[PDB]
Homo-oligomer: A and B are copies of this chain.
Amino acid sequence: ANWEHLLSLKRQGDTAKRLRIEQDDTRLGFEVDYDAIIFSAPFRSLQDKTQVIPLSKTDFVHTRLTHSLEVSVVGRSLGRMVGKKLLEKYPHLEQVYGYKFNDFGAIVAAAALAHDIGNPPFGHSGEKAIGEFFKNGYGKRYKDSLTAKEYQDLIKFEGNANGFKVLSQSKPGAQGGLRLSYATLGAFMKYPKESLPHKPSDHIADKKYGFFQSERALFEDVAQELGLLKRSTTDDVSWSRHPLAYLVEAADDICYTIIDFEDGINLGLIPEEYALEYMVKLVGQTIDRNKYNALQETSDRVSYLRALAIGTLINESVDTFMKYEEEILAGTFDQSLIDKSNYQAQITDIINLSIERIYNSREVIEKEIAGYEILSTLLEARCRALDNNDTHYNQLIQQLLAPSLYENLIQICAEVSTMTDGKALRNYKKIKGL
């Protein structure tokens, strides 16, 4: 595998190569990617989407937008530091080809900013509501008119794969979606495989899949340009992760681990009495305890803890990446960067506490139950309208929600998934009379 190819500036449709040495550094393709996401309608919709806790007006809770912002800031810092060490290890990359360390921060920052852009509302219940609808619900009907992989895309519908669709969807007047650089699309793709075969190993890259059948041709072009290593020689295609995808994943791991905990303390789902017990190993050498004791607000004490722990995990993740860089470059690294952490046990303890106190709180459970009905209802109305587009009621459903059979079902799923929490509830409420 070669870093020169992995850092591709190609955009979908390019008829001629884009050499890094010929880029205007004030218009660097990788940094244009970041700005294109900031201004995109899919990214704006993250402002009104729950990350974990249902939104309120009585308290601040992280939305998908604020979470994605934080992951891109952590990812930019990981890419910057890993970039400098990579340029020191492969100095031809800078001296010949012209890559700079901020290039790597820009790729990770942009892929991180977009990493959750395709996720359905109401969390992973959203994903399973969609999947079960086609497994056993009304969607079962279509099984026999679909290939095994087309159907697998639906019964195991994945927000990561919908994110890739969102980023590249071609519509009239706008071919290629956001047209992000192939390097950013590679750093985005943490599961570079189709929906089948299902979990062919215990590798984290095989836990899910990363693109739908409708996007397969695009990711084939991406993987070829990047020179990603094959992980399958059958007609079920699969590739080793772009190395920078490991940094997007780590930024994400770091943020939801530490920041879910922070939110849980500020919302009162986790007793503040637990904050230091769970963070002491992550912060013990850098914490200024006198400063911590002088802070008079809970939210200030816990944000100080969060900033210390995130700093700790960033430095360690940079070191883990470089110690396993050749294994990662050869596609033989079998785990995540955080799985190798010396704080693995503490991370696991924090995550389990959050699962117990936040994910299993009444409000999060209530939301996931409500989500299952809201999304199943919307999917039933979309699909009935698709099957009999002639009735008056179905023409209304089309006007309200959406003004090849697989291409239609995958598009219905993508459109339901990119609904904000509010719009989905309002449409649900009107379909049901309220």
Complex contact B39–A303 (CB within 8 A): yes
CA distance A174 to B295 in the complex (A): 7
**By the criterion CB–CB under 8 Å, are B26 and A84 in contact?**
yes
> A114 → chain B, closest Cβ, in Å?
14
Residue pair A77, B35 in contact (C-beta under 8 Å): yes
30 residue pairs of the A-B complex, CB under 8 angstroms, read A25-B80, A25-B101, A26-B77, A26-B80, A26-B81, A26-B84, A26-B101, A34-B73, A35-B77, A38-B69, A38-B73, A39-B70, A41-B300, A41-B303, A45-B60, A47-B47, A47-B63, A47-B65, A47-B66, A48-B57, A48-B60, A57-B423, A57-B425, A58-B422, A69-B69, A171-B295, A172-B295, A173-B295, A173-B300, A174-B300
> Assuming the A-B contacts A44-B66, A57-B423, are A173 and B294 also in contact, with contact meaning beta carbons closer than 8 angstroms in the complex?
yes
Contact of A422 among B48, B57, B73 (CB under 8 A): B57
B-contact bits for A23-50, CB 8 A (1 contact / 0 none) = 0011000000011001101001101100
Residue A299 lies at the interface, judged by CB distance under 8 Å to chain B: yes
**Nearest-Cβ distance from residue A428 to partner chain B, whole angstroms:** 12
Q: How many copies does the complex hold?
A: 2
A84: chain B residues within 8 A (beta carbon): 25-26
Interface residues of A in 275-318 (CB under 8 A from B): 291-296, 299-300, 303, 306-307
A219 to chain B, nearest CB (A): 24
Interface of A is mostly: helix
Q: A188 → chain B, closest Cβ, in Å?
A: 19
Say yes or no: is A346 at the interface (Cβ < 8 Å to chain B): no
User: In the complex, A291 Cα to B176 Cα: how many Å?
Assistant: 13
Residue in chain B with minimal CB distance to A288: B173
